[PDB]
Design a protein around this ligand. Structure first.
Ligand SMILES: C[C@H]1O[C@H](O[C@H]2[C@H](O)[C@@H](O)[C@@H](O[C@H]3[C@H](O)[C@@H](O)[C@@H](O)O[C@@H]3CO)O[C@@H]2CO)[C@H](O)[C@@H](O)[C@@H]1N[C@H]1C=C(CO)[C@@H](O)[C@H](O)[C@H]1O
Ligand SMILES: C[C@H]1O[C@H](O[C@H]2[C@H](O)[C@@H](O)[C@@H](O[C@H]3[C@H](O)[C@@H](O)[C@@H](O)O[C@@H]3CO)O[C@@H]2CO)[C@H](O)[C@@H](O)[C@@H]1N[C@H]1C=C(CO)[C@@H](O)[C@H](O)[C@H]1O
Ligand SMILES: OC[C@H]1O[C@H](O[C@H]2[C@H](O)[C@@H](O)[C@@H](O)O[C@@H]2CO)[C@H](O)[C@@H](O)[C@@H]1O
Ligand SMILES: [Ca+2]
Ligand SMILES: [Ca+2]
Ligand SMILES: [Ca+2]
Ligand SMILES: [Mg+2]
Ligand SMILES: [Mg+2]
Ligand SMILES: [Mg+2]
Ligand SMILES: [Mg+2]
Ligand SMILES: [Mg+2]
Ligand SMILES: [Mg+2]
Ligand SMILES: [Mg+2]
Ligand SMILES: [Mg+2]
Ligand SMILES: [Mg+2]
Ligand code: NI
Ligand code: NI
Lengths: 1247, 474
């Protein structure tokens, strides 16, 4: 904010004057003045004499003036330029310009305080001078006058009929024009007349100028304006017809046009032109539709005929143009115009795609408050109902939000809209089809008419403000749900996956992580539904294998709980309480439940707390008074505390779910839909408490209002743990509905009895659950499951009288394995009629059958096996192979391809064998899938009978990132070759620690191995603290100055049966300053874990892309990178990862070469290794697309990638390494538009 | 999104919008509830111990059930007992079909083939699902004869009969359909609908809700960059065909600002000039300077004039003045000030939508009155770019406004057209000095204080001063 310095040189030459100004440095400022006309001066200020920037497009590039012959007198102070019309004085000390008329009248001057500077011009003039220019007003603004005597409005083009620019002039005889892209003119009534470049204005700035180029005009307004047009350009002449009247019109076609022109001509009302709005063009369509004549509206525009016929009637045509292209046709296909624009960079910078609307329609709200209005609404709805609309999604019953229409519906609109459909559908069907509706508001009473509530247009993000701030996301939703419940509307759901994104419908889908977590969440809410914006897709397979499998998994849990759930639907008809409730319902005096929403009750007997955090490794979960049993992991917790709960951030398989002691939970086989088949056996899991608890099992038709007049079935189930037995009462049948249930199978957890009695009779004992199920009439059996000892008791349901069962004694199973019969498991395949099957047509099977039709590509069977801790589980597959030779099948665990199983011929189809494979399981639920994956080279073609999963692993693992961290310990991905989804760093402050919860079957000494990094150069120390006992020192050597190296610290620890705490803390004497990754635990010597075989760093590309990996890339010199890593969720439909959240891609609009490589030193030189990857290719066939192995001692090995669109597995086996290292790579050579996706790359030591 | 606690609460009791819920129902885990019968109202709590409820004034949402008495309920018990009592007073919930405990896929942008393929994708994977919910796709929303209640057989051919219902039932799929509590009162062809006539004659529209123009087919678009030569070449190249077949003037709209949903993007100050430059350079090359360019844009920044463009005053209001009918757009009376402000910035080739663009309720709203129309045509005829325009399916031919509007319009048009050779000289003048057909009086009278802010009259060429009648009933 400072003016020019003194003149140190003046060089006149023709009409130019060049001034050098002192700024105190060797690089002086320049000020070039040019006299352009007698009444027009150019001034260019170049700070430090640097070259001027290019002139903006304000300036006419072709402007040209006659020589003026001005008089420039450099002899005196001031320096003096004169013409006949003006006099310019520049004082020397400091340099200051005064502008005058020839006659000496002062027009304006730069003040002492400062004139021109680096960022603008500053003048002073007569304070009563009237100023003009700068700005106009738009069609949304208050409209001022012409005077600009107190102005600070920016100079901009503006919008909606605005005009403006850096042009301030006065009727007092002068004008000032500054070459600028936007900026801030300033005037006030002290006489100031200023212009500042200022900061980037709202409209953007794409022409910046290091210089200040300005023009000073002198004269009357006509002369001022003439000079403005010499500088900025004159207007070319419009066609003469442009002086005529024109009729602009929106909503018009060729017939109407012709009528309109006839009307004008018949009445001798002149007219030269019509302007046509959207009507004229095929806006919305492919092939440059927004440039081509709409021949539906204007048929004769197929040729020049329309032009020529209107010419003959004296009509020229004008056509509307929007400076934008349609990037998606009405069929949701990328347009040709998109491809051309995207490839050549023709989109406006900073403007992304966005969703517009363009066909208007006129609507008006209906009144549901009137009975006669409601009847009419229903009567016109009947035809839609008979043709299959049987649920009513009653949208927008709350508020209209649309231009000038901001109208509110009243508080009873949702109830009355709902009543219309309810009284209506009830009358028409004679109480024979139950009503289902949803609305997006609730007020009391509305529930009488059978409506749910959904949370409206929520955002596709983790929480409010993650991605944008105008809608909440996933994390807020439990608070909405529980608030609805506190209002007596527990029948609630949400748009799982979110509705809104930045840019509207074209905005991103949810990430695979966000989608997976949201499905896990919604499976434990009452109205379980996905939704999204226009042309968005929400099918779980589109989000990659983790999202598919985890979603499937939690959906199986929900559907297995149908009989549990449905009893709550019944309760809502008696008391209004439904399937969910907040903890404060059950714990009204617990201050920790008062505002608790991160967990909630699902029915009476399950507390659920979904993982809602992005990249979350552990949850803090409040458990209120009682005793809780982990649904998936088996351990107990006592209530009245907040627990630390590890979750596997890599698999996304956990849904933290806890059984309340007392629980009586009816459940059933998984159906594809609710009434797919009759269910004749209901399971009832019972976890007895010392006080009686009960559950009233309930059936009815599921369809009609018959239940209202007694047509239903109920039976009261009740349980109690006694001093030395468990008592369970199956009360007598009640009601008139003949239920489908024939037998309950009670699963009484906590005791494996030696006897089960009832009415003076000891029930017949069978050897196992299987043999019990196959028996007719009553029995018992016992076993072990994830929870511990269990007693099974099979009974008739729907007896006319009460049955009281008492399980006594304790005779625990010695079973070491659970058995899952795969014919009870999940059967799938590529199409609905090529799924794997159940069969009994060969002998020797266990259970009720085995699984066949693993002989069409993609056929598979999927078992959900619970594990108490993470680790190595040797899982036995019983199968038959009567094909004459060995057959292959993939084993997938938690959506990762673990192994190709080679299954030997067994002699015949009725002869069975066993293959045992060590599986990397995670604590809680695991997804184990045996699949014919022809794209991985499997053959399929075997039959599977069961699998056997040990109750205990051979060795356990615990992730450091999922441990309780304290004292500054945190998680990080900022170094390479960690296992799992992260590691623990920042063990630097005293008190910093990681505390593992380790389980043991028996008291004893166990081996530990702790995986740690130490790149400090020297040995460092932590303390180990087992069960709060005495600190032992842990001495951790350093491989060197390198944080990408990991070693094992081996040690023993004395442990107790059950839960143990083992901490690694920096105590005051310890030095700290190491990174921890995983603790392995076993009764035997610890070996390589099945989860940790991968020698690559970031082989799954899951690492947050802010952080690097051992991957490197290459392209030819001067080519942009074609390589990135992301989730594919921006695309519609999503092109998702193969597993978890991310995948590498190669893509370019133009021709390209691209590779990525990773080099690793192998653990054992002179041995065999193996490369596996998932790869997907689409669009243009490339010249080369391959996996590559090289640098290993032998010559390059290649495996080609085949253009398809689908995820395939590429494998390079028998990599004989003799160099000590291996380079694995992927390379594409493309002519353009080849997309390659790479995922799940593993380099392992090969059998 | 807050918590569950309502310990310091003044939020009103309403149904709300967009997933909201509320009511005059206040209860505590300390062992009590309070339910008041009310249509809206104002619950109040605070940490000194107040638990209050006020009817107060008419809410935002309206109030159709007013009450002289005060009917309330006190509940005593633990939370589940309070909630049961609430359901005794306001109603228990009827049981929903059992399938409604299943998974449901809701979708917007779906036809029969896609639905079938989705369902096949679930079943093939043994991923359970009981229901698809269909958005607008399922219905002939926008058409006559109750189209907003009728299956769209272009998207769902087999919903012509019970076939879709039945094949989907066989696959374990129930169908849900979206409903909107409104009807279309003008079909796509601007014709009043059967459903309109039925609701109007029976009184079935929501009180206080007039009709209004909504939009319903979404399209995806992206702005082009006219700042680059190769972009302009491309834009022109693709316009040649439309030009050969009769588009000889370029009405370049929305070169200023995107105001659309979440999308709020500005174009730069040279956007108009450069858009204009694309058509100018192009047409001139292609016709070898044989066909004069004409264009209009709704913004002006200096230099844009070089590329042959006029300026229009945007989506102005169909009204005499700002605030006569609505406050959010100016009307006719303001337009001289805008025109003359453009002139002072060197853009005298200026026009306006004679008749106005915007009315209350959108395109469905009122045309100009004959008086407004007539006075505006008279004014228009003495401005440089003389044009009527209006909103979607609105009409601006003068004969529709009755015989005074017809005849007075004709008359003033005849005056304008007789002045062709007077006018055309000023067109020539704008090619030499940039001065044009209008100018404010302060150009001729730079020292007259009565001319300094004067915009109720102006000069049309050098020798005529015009001051159109713009007051109602003046
Ligand atoms: C048709 C017009 O649509 C867009 O702008 C209009 C809005 O959609 C309207 O809702 C209205 O907005 C106002 C609110 O209703 C009101 O409550 C208040 O908040 O003010 C708002 C205005 O600030 O009016 C808008 C302006 O007309 C769109 O942005 C606009 O460009 C559209 N007009 C052009 C389009 C066509 C159709 O091709 C042409 O016929 C016109 O000449 C164009 O200027
Ligand atoms: C489709 C949806 O549209 C309407 O509301 C949405 C707006 O159209 C969007 O532009 C967006 O507005 C936000 C601005 O982008 C943002 O800058 C900020 O100002 O906040 C605005 C909103 O607070 O989002 C709006 C909300 O989605 C309309 O009012 C709404 O009812 C519409 N949603 C229903 C329509 C369909 C299609 O039939 C259903 O699929 C949905 O489930 C409905 O809820
Ligand atoms: O009014 C003159 C003023 O202009 C500049 O400030 C700009 C600022 O850069 C913009 O970001 C925006 O907020 O508008 C302002 C003007 O309204 C100068 O930096 C300042 O010194 C000067 O007084
Ligand atoms: Ca079996
Ligand atoms: Ca780890
Ligand atoms: Ca991955
Ligand atoms: Mg010169
Ligand atoms: Mg004054
Ligand atoms: Mg600068
Ligand atoms: Mg029309
Ligand atoms: Mg004709
Ligand atoms: Mg066409
Ligand atoms: Mg779709
Ligand atoms: Mg089919
Ligand atoms: Mg139809
Ligand atoms: Ni402005
Ligand atoms: Ni509210």
């Amino acid at each position: 904010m400072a003016g020019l310095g003194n003149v140190t040189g003046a060089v006149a030459s023709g009409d130019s004057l060049t001034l050098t100004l002192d700024n105190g440095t060797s690089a002086s400022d320049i000020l070039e003045l040019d006299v352009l006309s007698e009444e027009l001066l150019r001034v260019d200020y170049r700070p430090s004499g640097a070259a001027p920037s290019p002139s903006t497009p304000m300036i006419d590039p072709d402007a040209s003036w006659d020589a003026v012959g001005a008089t420039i007198d450099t002899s005196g102070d001031p320096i003096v330029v004169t013409t006949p019309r003006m006099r310019i004085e520049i004082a020397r000390t400091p340099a200051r310009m005064t502008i005058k008329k020839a006659d000496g009248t002062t027009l304006l001057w730069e003040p002492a305080s400062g004139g021109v500077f680096e960022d603008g011009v500053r003048f002073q003039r007569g304070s009563t001078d009237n100023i003009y220019g700068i700005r106009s007003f738009n069609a949304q603004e208050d409209v001022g006058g012409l005077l600009r005597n107190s102005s600070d409005h920016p100079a901009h083009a503006g919008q909606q009929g605005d005009a403006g620019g850096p042009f301030m002039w006065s009727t007092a005889g002068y004008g000032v024009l500054v070459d600028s892209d936007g900026g801030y003119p300033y005037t006030d009534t002290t006489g100031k007349l200023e212009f500042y470049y200022g900061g980037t204005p709202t409209e953007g700035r794409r022409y910046t100028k290091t210089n200040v180029e300005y023009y000073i005009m002198v004269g009357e307004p006509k002369e001022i304006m003439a000079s403005y047009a010499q500088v900025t350009g004159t207007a070319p002449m419009l066609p003469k017809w442009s002086l005529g009247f024109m009729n602009f019109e929106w909503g018009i076609d060729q017939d109407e046009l012709e009528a309109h022109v006839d009307g004008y001509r018949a009445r001798n009302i002149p007219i030269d032109a019509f302007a046509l709005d959207y009507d004229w063009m095929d806006y919305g369509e492919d092939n440059y539709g927004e440039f081509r004549w709409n021949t539906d509206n204007f048929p004769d525009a197929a040729t020049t005929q329309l032009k020529e016929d209107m010419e003959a009637e004296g009509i020229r045509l004008i056509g509307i143009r929007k400076p934008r292209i349609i990037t998606r046709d009405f069929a949701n296909q990328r347009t040709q115009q998109y491809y051309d624009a995207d490839s050549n960079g023709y989109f406006y910078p900073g403007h992304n795609e966005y969703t517009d609307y363009f066909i208007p329609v006129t609507v008006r709200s209906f009144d549901p408050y009137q009975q006669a209005s409601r009847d009419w609404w229903w009567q016109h709805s009947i035809d839609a109902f008979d043709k299959g609309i049987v649920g009513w999604w009653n949208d927008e019953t709350d508020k209209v939000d649309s231009g000038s229409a901001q109208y509110w519906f009243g508080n009873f609109s949702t109830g009355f809209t709902s009543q219309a459909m309810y009284d209506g559908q009830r009358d028409y069907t004679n109480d024979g089809v139950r009503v289902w509706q949803t609305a997006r508001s609730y007020y009391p009473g509305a529930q009488r008419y059978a409506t749910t509530l959904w949370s409206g247009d929520i955002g596709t993000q983790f929480y409010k403000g993650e991605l944008f701030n105008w809608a909440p996301g996933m994390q807020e939703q439990p608070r909405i749900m529980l608030s609805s419940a506190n209002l007596g509307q527990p029948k609630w759901g949400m748009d799982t996956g979110g509705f809104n994104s930045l840019g509207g419908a074209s905005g991103p889908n949810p990430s695979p992580e966000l989608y997976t977590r949201w499905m896990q969440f919604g499976a434990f809410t009452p109205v379980f539904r996905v939704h999204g914006n226009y042309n968005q897709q929400r099918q779980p397979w589109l989000y990659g294998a983790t999202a598919e499998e985890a979603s499937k998994a939690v959906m199986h849990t929900r559907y297995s709980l149908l009989p549990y759930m449905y009893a709550y639907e019944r309760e809502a008809s008696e008391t209004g309480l439904g399937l969910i409730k907040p903890l404060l319902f059950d714990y009204p005096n617990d201050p920790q439940a008062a505002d608790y929403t991160e967990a909630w009750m699902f029915g009476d007997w399950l507390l659920v707390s979904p993982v809602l955090g992005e990249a979350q490794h552990s949850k803090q979960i409040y458990l209120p008074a009682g005793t809780w049993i982990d649904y998936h992991r088996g351990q107990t917790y006592s209530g009245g505390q907040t627990i630390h709960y590890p979750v596997n951030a890599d698999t996304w398989t956990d849904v933290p779910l806890f059984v309340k002691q007392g629980a009586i939970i009816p459940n059933q086989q998984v159906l594809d839909y609710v009434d797919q088949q009759s269910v004749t056996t209901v399971n009832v899991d019972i976890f007895p408490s010392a006080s009686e608890t009960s559950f009233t099992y309930y059936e009815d038709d599921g369809s009609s209002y018959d239940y209202e007049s007694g047509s239903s079935f109920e039976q009261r189930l009740a349980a109690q743990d006694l001093s030395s037995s468990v008592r369970v009462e199956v009360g007598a049948g009640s009601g008139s509905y003949t239920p489908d249930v024939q037998h309950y199978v009670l699963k009484i957890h906590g005791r494996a009895g030696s006897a089960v009695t009832a009415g003076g009779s000891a029930l017949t004992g069978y050897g196992d659950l299987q043999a019990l199920q196959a028996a007719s009439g009553s029995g018992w059996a016992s076993g072990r499951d994830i929870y511990g000892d269990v007693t099974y008791v099979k009974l008739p349901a729907a007896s006319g009288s009460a049955t009281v069962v008492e399980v006594s004694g304790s005779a625990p199973s010695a079973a070491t394995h659970a058995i899952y019969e795969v014919e009870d498991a999940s059967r799938s395949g590529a199409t609905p009629t090529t799924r794997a099957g159940i069969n009994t047509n060969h002998s020797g099977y266990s259970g009720s059958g085995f699984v066949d039709k693993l002989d069409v590509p993609g056929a598979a069977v999927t078992v959900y096996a619970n594990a108490p801790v993470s680790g190595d589980y040797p899982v036995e597959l019983r199968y038959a192979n009567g094909s004459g030779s060995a057959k292959t099948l993939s084993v997938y665990v938690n959506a990762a391809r673990v192994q190709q199983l080679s299954l030997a011929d067994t002699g015949a189809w009725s002869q069975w064998g066993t293959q045992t494979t060590t599986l990397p399981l995670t604590a809680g639920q695991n997804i184990i899938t045996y699949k014919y994956d022809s794209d991985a080279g499997d053959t399929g073609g075997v039959n599977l009978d069961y699998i056997r999963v040990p109750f205990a692993p051979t060795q356990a693992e615990y992730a450091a990132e999922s441990a309780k961290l304290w004292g500054g310990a945190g998680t990080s991905q900022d170094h390479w070759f960690y296992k799992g989804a992260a590691f623990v760093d920042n063990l630097t402050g005293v008190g910093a620690e990681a505390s593992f919860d380790v389980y043991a079957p028996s008291a004893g000494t166990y081996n530990l191995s702790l995986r740690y990094a130490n790149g400090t150069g020297s040995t460092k120390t932590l303390s180990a603290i087992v069960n709060g006992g005495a600190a032992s020192t842990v001495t951790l050597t350093s491989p060197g100055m390198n944080w990408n190296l990991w070693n094992e610290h081996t040690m023993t620890a004395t442990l107790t049966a059950g839960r143990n705490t083992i901490s690694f803390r920096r105590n005051s004497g310890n030095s700290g300053n190491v990174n921890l990754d995983r603790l392995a635990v076993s009764a035997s010597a610890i070996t390589t874990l099945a989860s940790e075989r991968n020698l690559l760093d970031n082989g799954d590309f899951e690492r947050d892309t802010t952080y690097n990996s051992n991957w490197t890339q290459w392209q030819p010199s001067g080519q942009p990178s074609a390589f990135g890593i992301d989730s594919g969720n921006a695309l519609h439909p999503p092109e998702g990862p193969a597993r978890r959240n991310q995948r590498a891609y190669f893509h370019s609009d133009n021709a390209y070469q691209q590779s990525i490589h990773q080099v690793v030193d192998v653990p054992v030189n002179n041995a065999t290794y193996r490369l596996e990857a998932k790869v997907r290719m689409k669009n243009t066939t490339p010249t080369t697309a391959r996996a590559e192995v090289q640098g290993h001692g032998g010559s390059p090995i290649y495996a080609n990638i085949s253009n398809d669109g689908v995820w395939k597995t590429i494998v390079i086996d028998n990599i004989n390494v003799t160099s000590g290292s291996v380079d694995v790579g992927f390379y594409v050579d493309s002519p353009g538009y080849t997309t390659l996706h790479i995922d799940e790359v593993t380099l392992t030591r090969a059998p």
